[PDB]
Amino acid sequence: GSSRISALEYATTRKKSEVVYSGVSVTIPTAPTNLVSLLKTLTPSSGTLAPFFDTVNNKMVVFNENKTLFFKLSIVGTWPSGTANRSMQLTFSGSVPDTLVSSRNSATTTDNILLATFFSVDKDGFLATNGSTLTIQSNGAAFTATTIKIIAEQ
Amino acid sequence: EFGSSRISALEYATTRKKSEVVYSGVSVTIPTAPTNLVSLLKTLTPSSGTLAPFFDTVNNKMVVFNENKTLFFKLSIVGTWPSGTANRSMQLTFSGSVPDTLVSSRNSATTTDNILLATFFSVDKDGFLATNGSTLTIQSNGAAFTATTIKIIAEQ
Amino acid sequence: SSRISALEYATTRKKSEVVYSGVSVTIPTAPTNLVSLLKTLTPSSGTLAPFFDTVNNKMVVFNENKTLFFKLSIVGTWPSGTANRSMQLTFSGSVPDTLVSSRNSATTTDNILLATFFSVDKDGFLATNGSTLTIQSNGAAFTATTIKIIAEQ
Ligand SMILES: N[C@@H](CCC(=O)O)C(=O)O
Ligand SMILES: N[C@@H](CCC(=O)O)C(=O)O
Ligand SMILES: N[C@@H](CCC(=O)O)C(=O)O
């Protein structure tokens, strides 16, 4: 069945946004900050925010499919020298909001960050209709990001 | 050949199976002692979703389909530790051939108490998870935690 | 016929899942090539091949537009009394990724679970170069007694 086969091929084709900002100086402040708003002003080194990051409404958006979305944010940067307790926090709005935190303390010298998660998108569900506002906040002190890689795939 | 049967099998293979359960507007203590998570949740009435088929409420464990398909797990908890709690963490252990221990730790720099634990389990046909399931044991560290919304997902 | 067989390939998981049991392995406080460390140990089950290259001491991937999922589960210990402590794992790449599992006095368990994914592109950086995995223990060295490592694609 060519039509059923084509549907299976579509279902098993990864769709994604994978955007790299190399050589930027993005301050991630200590106050809640819309992440897409922060990124959309920057010229990417590679990739595009579309289709998963909507630069008009400053949100992550998804395809209307019963297919899970995988998300990763990799940040190279620094907190100020001497900052001990510190964390990077990223919240996704949703029916139940999800709050990611990468915390560290005096024991860890590296300031680089890797946040990863997934969203089990339902057809005609909350994410499919509303998208998700991503709100980022640096805790302990402001963070200065010099490379950012952001991925959403479904 | 077996074309028809193989297409139907592929349709099954690419259909997500899931439990996605939300408990909204609750007030649930996650204590500092090890607590069977399924035992804790099954006392609550879901606002949406069902524990079946991934959470066995007789044996109080997560169970999986016997197929070479990875299971993705997420636990999202809205709640609080007592005011002033500085060092604190939420931990979740899954029994297995090698047990896995998830920890979300934080300190004075982070004021939010909300928790997001996510992972995967690479289920093998006739393997440990498929044969035994996994006991999930949750524990709050620093002080007891009071959860007001819980969302739990297992999918395969 | 062939589109069906191709779909069967596309939807079949490929994996390395290696368990090292009953070991007492120091993960030092200095950067350490993880594949170099593991390949000295005898697995209780599984094989480093095909995802872990023990000649160049790196993770390697299939040259396919298919995401790789990675998990490292470690049973072990920091020295008694260690409060602030963390385990970190860096993957080289076009942009390197640094995973950190940190904890403090509130947490008693020392066991570690690091999980992530890599959105491999055909003929992309990972497919062309692989990834060097560098592990480091912070606060004090960590003694690992069971290690389970998974890469799947
Ligand atoms: N099923 C929810 C997402 C659940 C999740 O947070 O993964 C939705 O479609 O909006
Ligand atoms: N392959 C193991 C699971 C490994 C993992 O922890 O992901 C099983 O089938 O029980
Ligand atoms: N697309 C990148 C991987 C991106 C990631 O780190 O997930 C590659 O093929 O090398």
Residue numbers in the entry:
A (entry chain A): 164 to 317
B (entry chain B): 162 to 317
C (entry chain C): 165 to 317
The authors write:
The six trimeric tailspikes (above) are bound to the lower sides of the tail, and a single trimer of the product of P22 gene 26 (gp26) forms a long “needle” that extends outward from the center of the base of the tail. The long shaft domains have a three-strand coiled-coil structure with 11–16 repeats of heptad amino acid sequences, and the N-terminal 27 residues fold back on the surface of the coiled-coil in the P22 structure to form what may be the site through which the needle binds in the tail channel to form the plug.
The HS1 tail needle (encoded by locus_tag EcHS_A0316 gene) is characterized by a virion-binding N-terminal domain 98% identical to that of Sf6, and a shaft-forming coiled-coil helical region predicted to be 210 Å long that is only 67% identical in sequence to Sf6. The C-terminus of the HS1 tail needle contains a domain (the knob) that is 99% identical to Sf6 in sequence. We cloned the HS1 prophage needle’s C-terminal knob and nine residues of its coiled-coil helical shaft fused to maltose binding protein (MBP) after polymerase chain reaction (PCR) amplification from E. coli strain HS DNA. Like the Sf6 knob, the HS1 tail knob structure contains a phosphate ion bound at the distal tip of the knob and an L-glutamate is present in the electron density at each of the three dimeric interfaces of the homotrimer. The phosphate ion makes polar contacts with HS1 needle residues S266 and N268 near the 3-fold axis at the distal tip of the knob. Alteration of these residues in Sf6 knob did not affect the stability of the protein. Although not surprising given the similarity of the two proteins, the presence of the bound glutamate molecules in the HS1 structure is consistent with their being universally present in the P22-like needle knob structures.
